[PDB]
Amino acid sequence: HSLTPLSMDVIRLGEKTVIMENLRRVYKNTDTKDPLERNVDLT
Amino acid sequence: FEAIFGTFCNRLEWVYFLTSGLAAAAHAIKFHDLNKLTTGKMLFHVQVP
């Protein structure tokens, strides 16, 4: 029931505002691949 | 007669290391006893998340 003020970047579009987050800071120098870097197959 | 109007010397201006921005990449340290030693090492200990 308590909130903590933290700062991020916000995009404004279509009368809705969206938080922008680059998760590269989490997966640095570790074994597990960042799931947002996906592979795609086309035939 | 033949006239010698003037004689001139080189007005060469000195240059110095720290006065050049190239020292910005550097970090200059003076070390009198450097002539005695032959090796220099630094050790890094890093663990991963």
From Swiss-Prot, chain B:
- Superkingdom of the organism of origin: Viruses
Q: Which residues form a coiled coil?
A: none
Where is this chain's protein located in or outside the cell?
Virion; Host nucleus
Q: What is said about its interaction partners and assembly? A: Homomultimer. Makes the hexons and eleven out of twelve pentons. Interacts with triplex proteins 1/TRX1 and 2/TRX2; adjacent capsomers are linked together in groups of three by triplexes, heterotrimeric complexes composed of one molecule of TRX1 and two molecules of TRX2. Interacts with scaffold protein; this interaction allows efficient MCP transport to the host nucleus. Interacts with capsid vertex component 2/CVC2. Interacts with the small capsomere-interacting protein/SCP.
Q: What family name appears in the similarity comment?
A: Belongs to the herpesviridae major capsid protein family.
User: What exactly does this protein do?
Assistant: Self-assembles to form an icosahedral capsid with a T=16 symmetry, about 200 nm in diameter, and consisting of 150 hexons and 12 pentons (total of 162 capsomers). Hexons form the edges and faces of the capsid and are each composed of six MCP molecules. In contrast, one penton is found at each of the 12 vertices. Eleven of the pentons are MCP pentamers, while the last vertex is occupied by the portal complex.
> What's the protein here called?
Major capsid protein
* Native species: Human cytomegalovirus (strain AD169) (HHV-5)
